[PDB]
C-alpha cells in the first residue's frame, strides 16, 4: 500500500503545447472604459457565451 | 531515454508486475518482471557455473 | 472539503462588517487587548533593560492597542468572509441573506444597491476587490461597491426553501428590478 | 490522542532541559520553566494532529481521482 | 518489541548520563562525588547499560525459531519495519557483545571526558546493532552512515599524534564512497517506488540496470571493508583512533560491508552477481596476497594488525560471493570469529604495550616473554588463532571459505589458500620477534597484565575457541537463512 | 511438533499474492534439504559397506558408490531464487 | 495586517524620542506586527482551497497552494529572525548596542516582508518588475543601515550596482516578451507558450540568478556577506533566497510546457559550475561567514537541481528542502552571534582587528567551545552534521529527496556531481568541527578568565545567574532538536509535501 | 562587434560612471517599450513605460544616496 501510495502521486501526466493549464476565468473586453464597440471586431458576444472550463479541484 | 520519458511511453512499471506474461522479447532498461525466459539467462549468464549444469 | 452554500463571492466591507457573529467580536475583543498583553508577557520572558520585570512605557501600551485594534479587526473581518465564500458555516448567514435579498426584489429594488459607478467601473472594481482577502494579512483591500459581479445566480431566492413560506413574499420577475443587467439595456444595447 | 500529545509534552520538556545546558545552570533551576515548556510543546503537539488527521482526509480524496487517471493509462 | 525497548533504553540512559555530570556545570568550581574517582560512578552506569542491551537481545533469543523462513520479530517502529533472521540474529548478538568490552577497554587510560566517550561508544554499539535489524535499503542507509557522527568525533577527540589526518579519513572515505550507495538505492526507489527488502528480492531489473546497481553499491561497500585499492584508510584510523574505537571499528563496522554484500547484492541483483563474482575474486585474491605481504615491511605495531584485518576480510568476501551453502556459511563463521581475535590483537598491541611503554615502533620491543610471561601466553594463543589454527573459530572460517571459492571457481579459487601460507608470515614474525631474545634494552620493567587486562582477553578467546570446537552453535541457525542467498538453475 | 512442508510449485502462484509468493519459496527449500538428507543416508551406507567389506568393498558396494556419485552433482541446496526468477519452459 | 501597522510605526517611530530602551520596544512591536499577519494569513488560507488557484487584483497577482506555503514560510523565519533584535542575544551591552541603536531596522525589514511574501505571487510582468524592486531596495537599505560602518556601506553599494543590472536583465526580458506577443499578463503569455522565444525567459532568469549569487555570478554574493555586520548577513543571505527560488519555480513550471532541450543543457551548465565553485572554493579560506557564504551557494545549487527537473517529486523535494535549510541557517547565524562572548581578550602578533559589527569573524575563533560550552556546541555540530548530509538529520533527506527528482528526470551527470560537490565540501565543513572538540583534551587542564563573558559583574554570587539571555537559548534549543529528531515526523511532514499542488490536480 | 564587449571601454573608471550606464542600458528599456506600445497602438505597454520611468528615477536617488553617504565616510574624521 506504501508503494502503490508513491506511485501515484509521484507520476508526473505529461503536459505539452496541446493540454496545459490556463488560469484565464473569463474573456476580457466586455467592458471598456471608452468607445467599448471600437472597429466592431469583438465578435464574442456575452450574451450568449458558452460554459467556460471551470478548474478541477481534486481534493473536492 | 530518462525514466520519467520512459514512463510516460509505457516502459516503466506503473501498472504493477505480473508472472504469468512472460516475454520473450528483451525487456527495456528500466523495466522490471517477475520472472524472465531461462534463454535470456543463459544468454547473459552463460551455461557453466551452476546454470543448467554445475 | 468542508464545502456550503456560496453567498456572496464578492461580500460587501458594510455587510462583511453586519455579519459578524458574536464571536467574533469577541476575537476583535481579544486582538485588540492581546497586543498590549504580548508586549508584557514579553517583558515576563525575558525583560528588555536589567534582569527584572519592568511594566512597559504608557506611551508605548497606547500604541500596541492601535496595532491590535487594526489588527485584530482584520482576524474578524476574514473569519466573516470565509462565511460567505462557502469555507466556512453559514447556516446563519444564508438565512439572513436570503431574507434580505428577498426583500429587496420585493421591494422592486436591486440586491446590491444603486451604484455611483458607470457599467465599467463596477466591472473593475470587481476584479479589483474579488478575493483581495487572500491577501489582507499582507495589505487591506476592501470591496466598498455596489456593483454586480458576486457570482451568483438570481433565480436562486425565488425557489422557497424551509422555513422560509412565512415571510409571504412577493417576487416580480428580474426585468423589472432597478438597477440590474437584465432590466437597464432597453433603448440602446451600449448604455444603461 | 492522548497518547500521542504526551508525547509532545515530553519533547517540549526536553527542549526546556536541553535549554539549561546551553546557559550553563543546574536542571533544577526554576521548575516552571518545564511546565510552560510543556504547555508550549502540547499546543503545537494538538496543532500537528490536526494537521495530520486534516491531511488523510484530504490524501485519500486525491487518491481516488488518481487511481482512475491510472485505470485509463492502464487501458 | 526489540527495536523499541532498546533504542528507548539508550535514549533514556543517554539523558540520564547528561543530566548527571552537567547539572555541575553551573558557575561552581566541579567540587563533586560523581567526579571523584576519574568520573566512576559514571563510567559504571554507562558500564551497565552497555550490558543490560545484551539481555534485550536474548529476551527475543529465546522465542527465535531456526526453521521457519523469513523474517521473524517483525515490528514497525518510527514508521520503520524491524526484522530478525539467522543472520541478523549472530551480528546483533557479537555487536553487543562487543558493547561493555570496548568500554570495560578504556576504563582507566583516559586524560578526561570519560562521560562523553561512554555515551559514544554506547550510540555507535546500538546504532550498528540497528543496523543489522532494519527492513529496507533506506533504512540500512541512515544506520550506515549515522555513525560517522560519533566516530567522527570520538577519534578526533580521544586520538593519538595523527589524529587530524585520520579523522578526515574515517569521515571522507566512509562518506564520499557511501554517496556512491544513495545513488543506487534512490534508483530503486523509483523504479520500484519501495526500498523494502522483500519487496525488492522479487523483482529482476534489465541486464543492464542491474549492472549500474551493482557498480553503485559494490563502492560503498569495497571501501567500508577494507579492498584494494581503496583500502588506505584503514590502516591510519586504527593506528590513530582510542582502543574503544579500534575494537569496535574492525569488531563489527568492518563486518557491515559483509552482511551488506547479504541484502544488498545477492538476493534482487542475483543475476549480476554471478556476472562480478569472477571479478571480486581478481580483487579479493589480490588483496588477500598484497595486504599479506606489505604487512611484512611495516614498522608500527598496531598499524601491522590493522593490515592483517585486512586480509582476514578477504577472505570473508571471496566466501560469501561464492554460490554455495559452504562458502557462505564459513564467511558468515569467520566474521563471528574474526569479531573476536581482531578485537583481542588491539587489546595486546595498543591497549597493554601502548598504555604503559607509550610507544608503538617494532624496534623497541623484543623478548617480552623474560618479564611478561602472561602476555606472551595470550599473545602466542591469540597469534595462533589469528592465523588459522584448527582448534580456533578462525580456521573454520577459513576452511570453509577457501572451500566455498574452489566449488565456485576451482581454478582461481585455489589462490584464496594463499591465506593459509601468508598469515602465517606476517602474524608470527611479529610474534617471534615479540617474544625472542634477550629483554629489550629500551624498556624497563613495569608491572605485568592486570586483572582488568586479563579479563577482556579470557572473554575475547573462550568464544574463539568455543566456535572453533563445535561450530554447530552456528551453523545450525544460518543453515536456513544462508540457503536462501543461493542462485542456481540445475536441468 | 513437526510442521511439513506445504508443496506449492511457482507456476501455480501468481506472485503479487504475497502469502503464497512466500510458501513457494518455502516449500522449494524444504524439499531441498530431504534431498541432501537422503544423500547423507546413502553415503552412511558407503562408509559401513566399505569397512564391513575390507578388500571386498569393490564388489559388495559397487551400486551404492555408484549411485552415490550420481547423486552428488544435484543432491546440495540450489536455492529458489534460479527457479523462481526463471522460467525453463522459454 | 502589514501595511496597516508598518505606517503606524513609521509615524510612531520618530514621535518619541531616540533612545535605545525605547528602540528595543518599538522592535517588540514588529515581531507582534509579524506574529499577527500569520494568524491571519493561517486563518484565510488553506492549501484545500488554493489548490486550483485563486486570481487577485485584477489578475495581478495569483495565489496557488505552492506559493501560500513559501509565504507561510517567509513570515516563520522573519519571527524567529526578529527575536534576534528584540531581544538580547549576548546580554552584554557592548555588542549588544548594534542592534538598539538604528530605529528604522525594524522599518525596514517590515518593508522587506511586503515584498518577500509578494513575489511568489507575480501574475503579471509589469507587478513583477515592481515587486522586485520592492523587495531589491529593501536589501540595499538594509545593507546600509550601520552608516557610521565603512564595510557595510561599501557592501550596499557594491550590492546596489549588481543588483541594479540584475533588475536591467530581468525589466529587458520583460521588454522583449511584450515586443513579440504584446501582451503582459502571464497567463495571457501561457496561451503563447508555443510562439513566443523561450529563451527571454531564461534571460530573465538570468537576472533572477544573479540575486541568488549562482555561479559565475557568486562573486559578489561572497564578498558581500563576508562584509556586513553578522546581524545583517544572518537576513540577506537567505530571505532573497526564500522569493526568488520560488519565483524561479514557477516560471520553470512554465517553461517545462514546451520542454525546451537546449534550455536545459544551458541551465544545467550553470549548476555543475555551481557544485564545482560552491565546494572547491571553500576550502582555503579563514573566515567563518565567508565559509557560510561558500555553503548557501552549495546549497542554492542542490536546489536549483530539484528545481530544473521540475516534476511532481520536485515539489515534494523543493518544498522540505527550502523548510529545512532556512531553519538550520537561522540555527547556525543564532548561535554564532551568541557565542561571540567567549572570545579572549589581550593583556602582539598579527594585529588581527576585531569589530563590534562582527565579533566572530575568522574561524578559529570557535577554538575550545567544547570546553565552554559543551551544549552549545553540540547543537554547533548538529547544525553542520545537517549541512554535511549525516544521516537521520534533516539535511539528509533533503539530499535524498533532491537525487530522487534529479534521478527521475534523467540528471544522472549532475546527480554525481552533486554527490562528488557533497564530499569535497564535506572537508570544509569538518573544519569547523575540528577547531570546536580536536583540542579538548590538550586543554582541559587551562587556567583563563580573560574571557569577554567574565567581565561582567558578579551580581550575588549565590543566585544562579545564567550566562545566557532565555530566549535566544531557546531558540536554538527549539530548532537543535528539529533537526535531529525529524525522523519520528519525516513520513508524516513529507506527506504534507504531498498534498502541495502547482496545477498538478489529476 | 558587441560580443567584444566593446561597451566596457565606453564606460568612465569611476562609481559615477557605473551609476550612468545602468540607466542608460534601464532607458533602451523604455524606448523600447514606448517603440511596442506605439505601433501595436497599446495603451498598456505605454502604462508600463511609465513605471519604468518612475521606478528607475527612485533607483537613482537610492544610488547616490549610498554613494555619498560612502563618500562622506572617507572624509568623516571632523576633528575641528
Ligand atoms: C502595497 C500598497 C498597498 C496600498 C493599499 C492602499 C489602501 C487600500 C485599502 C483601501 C481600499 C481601496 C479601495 C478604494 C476604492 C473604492 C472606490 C469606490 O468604490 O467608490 C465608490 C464608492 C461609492 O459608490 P457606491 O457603490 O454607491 O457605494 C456606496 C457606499 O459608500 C457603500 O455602499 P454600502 O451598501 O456598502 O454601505 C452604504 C452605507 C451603509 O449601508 C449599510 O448597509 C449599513 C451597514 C451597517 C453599518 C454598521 C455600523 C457601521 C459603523 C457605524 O454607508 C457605508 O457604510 C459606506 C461603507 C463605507 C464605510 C467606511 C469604510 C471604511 C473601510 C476602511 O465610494 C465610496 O463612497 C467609498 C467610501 C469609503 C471610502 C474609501 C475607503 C477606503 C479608503
Ligand atoms: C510520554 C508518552 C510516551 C510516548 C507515547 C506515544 O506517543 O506513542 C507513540 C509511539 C508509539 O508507537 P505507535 O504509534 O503505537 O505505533 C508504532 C510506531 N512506532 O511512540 C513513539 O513514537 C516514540 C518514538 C520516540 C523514540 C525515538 C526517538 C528518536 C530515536 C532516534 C533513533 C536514531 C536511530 C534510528
Ligand atoms: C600458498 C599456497 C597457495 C595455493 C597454491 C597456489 C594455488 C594455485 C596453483 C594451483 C592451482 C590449482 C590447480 C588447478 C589446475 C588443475 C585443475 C584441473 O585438474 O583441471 C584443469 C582444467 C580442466 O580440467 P581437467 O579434468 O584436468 O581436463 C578435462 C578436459 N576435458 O583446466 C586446465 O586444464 C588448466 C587449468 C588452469 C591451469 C592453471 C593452474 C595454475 C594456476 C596458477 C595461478 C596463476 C599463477
Ligand atoms: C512559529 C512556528 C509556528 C508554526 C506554524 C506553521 C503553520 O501553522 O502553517 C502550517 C503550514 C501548512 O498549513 P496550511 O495548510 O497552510 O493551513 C493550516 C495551518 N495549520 O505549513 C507551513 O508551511 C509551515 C512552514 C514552516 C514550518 C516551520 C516549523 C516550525 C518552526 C520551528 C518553531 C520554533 C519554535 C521556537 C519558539 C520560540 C519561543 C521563544
Ligand atoms: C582509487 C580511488 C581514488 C579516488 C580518487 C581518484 C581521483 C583522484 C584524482 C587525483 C589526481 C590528481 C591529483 C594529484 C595531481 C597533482 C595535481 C597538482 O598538484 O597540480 C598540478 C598542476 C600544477 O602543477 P603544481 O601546482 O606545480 O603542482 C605540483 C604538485 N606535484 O595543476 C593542475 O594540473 C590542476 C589541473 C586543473 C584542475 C582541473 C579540475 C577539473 C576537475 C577535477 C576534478 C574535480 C571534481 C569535479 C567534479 C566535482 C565538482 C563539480
Ligand atoms: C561583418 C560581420 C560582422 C559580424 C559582427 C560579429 C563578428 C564576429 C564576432 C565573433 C562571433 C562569434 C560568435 C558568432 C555568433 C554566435 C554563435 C552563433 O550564433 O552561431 C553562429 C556560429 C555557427 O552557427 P551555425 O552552426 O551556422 O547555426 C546554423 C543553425 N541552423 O556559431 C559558431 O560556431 C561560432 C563559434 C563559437 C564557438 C567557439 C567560441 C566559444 C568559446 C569561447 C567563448 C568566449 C568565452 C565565453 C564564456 C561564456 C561565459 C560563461
Ligand atoms: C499556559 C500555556 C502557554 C504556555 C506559555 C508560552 C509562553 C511562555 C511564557 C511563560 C512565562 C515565562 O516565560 O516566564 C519566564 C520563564 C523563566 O525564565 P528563565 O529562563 O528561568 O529566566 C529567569 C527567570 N526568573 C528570574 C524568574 C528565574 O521562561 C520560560 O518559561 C521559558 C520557556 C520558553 C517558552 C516556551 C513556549 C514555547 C512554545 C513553542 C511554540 C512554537
Ligand atoms: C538533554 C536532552 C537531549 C535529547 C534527548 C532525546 C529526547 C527525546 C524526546 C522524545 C519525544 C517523544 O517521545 O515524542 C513522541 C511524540 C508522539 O508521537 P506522535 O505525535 O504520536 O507521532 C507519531 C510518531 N510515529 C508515527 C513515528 C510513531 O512525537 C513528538 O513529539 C515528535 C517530536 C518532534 C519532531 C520534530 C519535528 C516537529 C516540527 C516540524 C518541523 C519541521
Ligand atoms: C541512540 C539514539 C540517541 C539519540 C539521542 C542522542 C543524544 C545526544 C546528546 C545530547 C546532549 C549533549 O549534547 O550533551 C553532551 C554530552 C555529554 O557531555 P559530557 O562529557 O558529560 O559533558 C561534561 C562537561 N563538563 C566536563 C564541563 C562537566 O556529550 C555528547 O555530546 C555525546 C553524545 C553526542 C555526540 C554526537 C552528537 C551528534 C549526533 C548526530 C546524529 C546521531
Redesign the interface.
Given at each position: 500500500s506504501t508503494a502503490d501510495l508513491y506511485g501515484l502521486i509521484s507520476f508526473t501526466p505529461k503536459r505539452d503545447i496541446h493540454h496545459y493549464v490556463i488560469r484565464v476565468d473569463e474573456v476580457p473586453g466586455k467592458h471598456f472604459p471608452t468607445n467599448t464597440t471600437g472597429n466592431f471586431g469583438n465578435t464574442v458576444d456575452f450574451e450568449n457565451l458558452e460554459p467556460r472550463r471551470k478548474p478541477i479541484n481534486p481534493y473536492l | 531515454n530518462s525514466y520519467r520519458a520512459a514512463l510516460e511511453a509505457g516502459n516503466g512499471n506503473e501498472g504493477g508486475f505480473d508472472n504469468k506474461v512472460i516475454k520473450t522479447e528483451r525487456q527495456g532498461f528500466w523495466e522490471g518482471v517477475y520472472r524472465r525466459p531461462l534463454s535470456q539467462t543463459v544468454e547473459d549468464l552463460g551455461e557453466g557455473r551452476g546454470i543448467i549444469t554445475q | 472539503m468542508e464545502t456550503y452554500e456560496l453567498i456572496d463571492s464578492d461580500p460587501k466591507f458594510s455587510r462583511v462588517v453586519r455579519y459578524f457573529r458574536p464571536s467574533d467580536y469577541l476575537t476583535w475583543a481579544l486582538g485588540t487587548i492581546g497586543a498590549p498583553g504580548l508586549m508584557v508577557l514579553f517583558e515576563k520572558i525575558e525583560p528588555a533593560k536589567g534582569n527584572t520585570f519592568k511594566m512597559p512605557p504608557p506611551s508605548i501600551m497606547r500604541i500596541a492597542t492601535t496595532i491590535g485594534f487594526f489588527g485584530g479587526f482584520y482576524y474578524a473581518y476574514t473569519s466573516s468572509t470565509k462565511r460567505f465564500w462557502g469555507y466556512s458555516e453559514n447556516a446563519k448567514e444564508v438565512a439572513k441573506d436570503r431574507y434580505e435579498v428577498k426583500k429587496a426584489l420585493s421591494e422592486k429594488k436591486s440586491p446590491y444597491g444603486s451604484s455611483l459607478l458607470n457599467p465599467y467601473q463596477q466591472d473593475m472594481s470587481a476584479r479589483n476587490s474579488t478575493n483581495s482577502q487572500l491577501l489582507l494579512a499582507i495589505f487591506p483591500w476592501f470591496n466598498v461597491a455596489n456593483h454586480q459581479s458576486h457570482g451568483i445566480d438570481l433565480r436562486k431566492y425565488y425557489e422557497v426553501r424551509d422555513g422560509e413560506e412565512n415571510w409571504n413574499f412577493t417576487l416580480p420577475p428580474l426585468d423589472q428590478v432597478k438597477d440590474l443587467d437584465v432590466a437597464q439595456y432597453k433603448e440602446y444595447s451600449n448604455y444603461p | 490522542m492522548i497518547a500521542s500529545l504526551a508525547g509532545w509534552g515530553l519533547?517540549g520538556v526536553?527542549?526546556?532541559?536541553?535549554?539549561?545546558?546551553?546557559?550553563?545552570?543546574?536542571?533544577?533551576?526554576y521548575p516552571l520553566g518545564y511546565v510552560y515548556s510543556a504547555l508550549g510543546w502540547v499546543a503545537f503537539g494538538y496543532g500537528?494532529n490536526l494537521?495530520?488527521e486534516r491531511?488523510?482526509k484530504?490524501?485519500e480524496?486525491?487518491?481516488e481521482?488518481?487511481?482512475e487517471?491510472?485505470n485509463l493509462?492502464?487501458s | 518489541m526489540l527495536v523499541q525497548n532498546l533504542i528507548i533504553f539508550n535514549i533514556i540512559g543517554i539523558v540520564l548520563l547528561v543530566l548527571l555530570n552537567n547539572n555541575n556545570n553551573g558557575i561552581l568550581n566541579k567540587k563533586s562525588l560523581l567526579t571523584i574517582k576519574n568520573e566512576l560512578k559514571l563510567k559504571q552506569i554507562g558500564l551497565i547499560i552497555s550490558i543490560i542491551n545484551i539481555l534485550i537481545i536474548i529476551e527475543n533469543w529465546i522465542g527465535f525459531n531456526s526453521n521457519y523462513y523469513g523474517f521473524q520479530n517483525i515490528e514497525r517502529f518510527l514508521n520503520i519495519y524491524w526484522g530478525i533472521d539467522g543472520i541478523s540474529l549472530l551480528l546483533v548478538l557479537l555487536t553487543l557483545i562487543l558493547g561493555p568490552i570496548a568500554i570495560l577497554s578504556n576504563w582507566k587510560n583516559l586524560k578526561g571526558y570519560y562521560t562523553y566517550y561512554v555515551i559514544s561508544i554506547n550510540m555507535l554499539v546500538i546504532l550498528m546493532a540497528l543496523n543489522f535489524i532494519c527492513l529496507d535499503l533506506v533504512s540500512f542507509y541512515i544506520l550506515f552512515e549515522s555513525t560517522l557522527a560519533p566516530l567522527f568525533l570520538l577519534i578526533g577527540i580521544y586520538g593519538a599524534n595523527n589524529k587530524n589526518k585520520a579523522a578526515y579519513y574515517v569521515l571522507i572515505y566512509t562518506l564520499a564512497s557511501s554517496l556512491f550507495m544513495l545513488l543506487s538505492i534512490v534508483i530503486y526507489y523509483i523504479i520500484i517506488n519501495s526500498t523494502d527488502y522483500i519487496y525488492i528480492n522479487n523483482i529482476i531489473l534489465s541486464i543492464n540496470l542491474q549492472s549500474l546497481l551493482f557498480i553503485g553499491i559494490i563502492i560503498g561497500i569495497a571501501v567500508k571493508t577494507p579492498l584494494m585499492p581503496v583500502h588506505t584508510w584503514l590502516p591510519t584510523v586504527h593506528s590513530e583512533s582510542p582502543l574503544g574505537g579500534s575494537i569496535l571499528l574492525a569488531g563489527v563496522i568492518l563486518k557491515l560491508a559483509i552482511y551488506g554484500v547479504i541484502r544488498l547484492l545477492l538476493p534482487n541483483l542475483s543475476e549480476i552477481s554471478m556476472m562480478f563474482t569472477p571479478i571480486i575474486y581478481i580483487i579479493s585474491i589480490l588483496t588477500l596476497i598484497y595486504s599479506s605481504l606489505i604487512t611484512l615491511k611495516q614498522t608500527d605495531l598496531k598499524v601491522i594488525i590493522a593490515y592483517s584485518s585486512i586480509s582476514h576480510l578477504a577472505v570473508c568476501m571471496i566466501g560469501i560471493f561464492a554460490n554455495n551453502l559452504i562458502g557462505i556459511n564459513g564467511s558468515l563463521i569467520l566474521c563471528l570469529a574474526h569479531g573476536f581475535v581482531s578485537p583481542a590483537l588491539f587489546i595486546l598491541v595498543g591497549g597493554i604495550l601502548y598504555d604503559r611503554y607509550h610507544n608503538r615502533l617494532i624496534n623497541y620491543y623484543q623478548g617480552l616473554s623474560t618479564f611478561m610471561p602472561i602476555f606472551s601466553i595470550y599473545l602466542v594463543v591469540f597469534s595462533f588463532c589469528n592465523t588459522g589454527t584448527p582448534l580456533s573459530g578462525n580456521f573454520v572460517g577459513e576452511f570453509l571459505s577457501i572451500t566455498g571459492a574452489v566449488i565456485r571457481h576451482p581454478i582461481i579459487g585455489s589462490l584464496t589458500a594463499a591465506s593459509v601460507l601468508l598469515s602465517a608470515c606476517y602474524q608470527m614474525k611479529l610474534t617471534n620477534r615479540l617474544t625472542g631474545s634477550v629483554f629489550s634494552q629500551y624498556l624497563h620493567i613495569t608491572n605485568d597484565v592486570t586483572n582488568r587486562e586479563i579479563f577482556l582477553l579470557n572473554w575475547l578467546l573462550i568464544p574463539t575457541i568455543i566456535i572453533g570446537i563445535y561450530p554447530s552453535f552456528v551453523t545450525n541457525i544460518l543453515n536456513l537463512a544462508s540457503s536462501t542467498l543461493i542462485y542456481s538453475v540445475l536441468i | 511438533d513437526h510442521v511439513r512442508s506445504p508443496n506449492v510449485s511457482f507456476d501455480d502462484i501468481d506472485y503479487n499474492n504475497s502469502q503464497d509468493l512466500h510458501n513457494a519459496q518455502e516449500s522449494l527449500l524444504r524439499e531441498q534439504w530431504i534431498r541432501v538428507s537422503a544423500l547423507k543416508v546413502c553415503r552412511k551406507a558407503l562408509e559401513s559397506c566399505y569397512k564391513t567389506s575390507g578388500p571386498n568393498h569393490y564388489e559388495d558396494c559397487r551400486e551404492i558408490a555408484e549411485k552415490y556419485l550420481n547423486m552428488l552433482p544435484d543432491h546440495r541446496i540450489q536455492g529458489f531464487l534460479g527457479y523462481q526468477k526463471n522460467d525453463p519452459s522459454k | 495586517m502589514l501595511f496597516t501597522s508598518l505606517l503606524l510605526i513609521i509615524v510612531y517611530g520618530s514621535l518619541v524620542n531616540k533612545s535605545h530602551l525605547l528602540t528595543k520596544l518599538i522592535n517588540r512591536l514588529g515581531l507582534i506586527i509579524i506574529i499577527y499577519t500569520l494568524l491571519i494569513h493561517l486563518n484565510i488560507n488553506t492549501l484545500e482551497n488554493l489548490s486550483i488557484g485563486i486570481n487577485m487584483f485584477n489578475n495581478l497577482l495569483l495565489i496557488n497552494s505552492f506559493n501560500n506555503t513559501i509565504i507561510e514560510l517567509i513570515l516563520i523565519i522573519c519571527i524567529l529572525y526578529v527575536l534576534l533584535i528584540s531581544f538580547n542575544i549576548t546580554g552584554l551591552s557592548i555588542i549588544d548596542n548594534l542592534n538598539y541603536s538604528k530605529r528604522t531596522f525594524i522599518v525596514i525589514v517590515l518593508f522587506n516582508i511586503i515584498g518577500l511574501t509578494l513575489l511568489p505571487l507575480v501574475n503579471d510582468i509589469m507587478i513583477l518588475f515592481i515587486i522586485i524592486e520592492l523587495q531589491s531596495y529593501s536589501l540595499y537599505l538594509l545593507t546600509a543601515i550601520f552608516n557610521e560602518s565603512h564595510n557595510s556601506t561599501k557592501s550596499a553599494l557594491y550590492y546596489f550596482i549588481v543588483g541594479s543590472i540584475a533588475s536591467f536583465i530581468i525589466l529587458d526580458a520583460t521588454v522583449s516578451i511584450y515586443d513579440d506577443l504584446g501582451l503582459t499578463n502571464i497567463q495571457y503569455i501561457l496561451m503563447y507558450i508555443d510562439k513566443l522565444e523561450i529563451f527571454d525567459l531564461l534571460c530573465l532568469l538570468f537576472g533572477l540568478f544573479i540575486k541568488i549569487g549562482l555561479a559565475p555570478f557568486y562573486s559578489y554574493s561572497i564578498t558581500i556577506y563576508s562584509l556586513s555586520p553578522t546581524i545583517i548577513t544572518n537576513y540577506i543571505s537567505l530571505m532573497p533566497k526564500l522569493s526568488i527560488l520560488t519565483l524561479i519555480y514557477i516560471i520553470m513550471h512554465y517553461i517545462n510546457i514546451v520542454n525546451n532541450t537546449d534550455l536545459n543543457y544551458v541551465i544545467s551548465f550553470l549548476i555543475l559550475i555551481s557544485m564545482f565553485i560552491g565546494s572547491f572554493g571553500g576550502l582555503n579560506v579563514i573566515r567563518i561567514k565567508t565559509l557560510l557564504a561558500y555553503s548557501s551557494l552549495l546549497n542554492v545549487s542542490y536546489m536549483l537541481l530539484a528545481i530544473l527537473s521540475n516534476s511532481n517529486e520536485s515539489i515534494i523535494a523543493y518544498i522540505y528542502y527550502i523548510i529545512q535549510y532556512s531553519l538550520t541557517h537561522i540555527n547556525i547565524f543564532s548561535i554564532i552571534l551568541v557565542i561571540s562572548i567567549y572570545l579572549p581578550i589581550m593583556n602582539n602578533m598579527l594585529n588581527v582587528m576585531i569589530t563590534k559589527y562582527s565579533p566572530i569573524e575568522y574561524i578559529n575563533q570557535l577554538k575550545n567551545l567544547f570546553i565552554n560550552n559543551i551544549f552549545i556546541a553540540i547543537a554547533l555540530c548538529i547544525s553542520i552534521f545537517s549541512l554535511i548530509g549525516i544521516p537521520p538529520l534533516t539535511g539528509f533527506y533533503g539530499k535524498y529527496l533532491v537525487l530522487i527528482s534529479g534521478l527521475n528526470n534523467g540528471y544522472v551527470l549532475l546527480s554525481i556531481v552533486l554527490i562528488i560537490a557533497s564530499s569535497i565540501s564535506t572537508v570544509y565543513y569538518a573544519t569547523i568541527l575540528k577547531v570546536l572538540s580536536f583540542d579538548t583534551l590538550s586543554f582541559k587542564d587551562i587556567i583563563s578568565n580573560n574571557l569577554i563573558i567574565n567581565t561582567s559583574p558578579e551580581n550575588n554570587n549565590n543566585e544562579i545567574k545564567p550566562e545566557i539571555s532565555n530566549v535566544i537559548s531557546y531558540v536554538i534549543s527549539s530548532l537543535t532538536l528539529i533537526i535531529l529528531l525529524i525522523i519520528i515526523q519525516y513520513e508524516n511532514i513529507v506527506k504534507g509535501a504531498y498534498l502541495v499542488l502547482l496545477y498538478n490536480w489529476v | 562587434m558587441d560580443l567584444i564587449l566593446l561597451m566596457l571601454v565606453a564606460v568612465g573608471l569611476n562609481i559615477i560612471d557605473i551609476y550612468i550606464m545602468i540607466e542608460i542600458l534601464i532607458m533602451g528599456c523604455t524606448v523600447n517599450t514606448i517603440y511596442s506600445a506605439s505601433l501595436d497602438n497599446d495603451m498598456i505597454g505605454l502604462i508600463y513605460s511609465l513605471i519604468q520611468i518612475i521606478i528607475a528615477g527612485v533607483e537613482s536617488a537610492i544610488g547616490l544616496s549610498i554613494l555619498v553617504n560612502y563618500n562622506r565616510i572617507r572624509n568623516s574624521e571632523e576633528i575641528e
Open positions: - | - | - | 519533547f526536553t527542549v526546556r532541559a536541553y535549554q539549561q545546558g546551553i546557559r550553563k545552570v543546574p536542571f533544577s533551576y500537528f494537521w495530520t491531511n488523510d484530504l490524501l480524496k486525491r487518491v481521482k488518481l487511481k487517471s491510472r493509462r492502464l | - | - | - | -
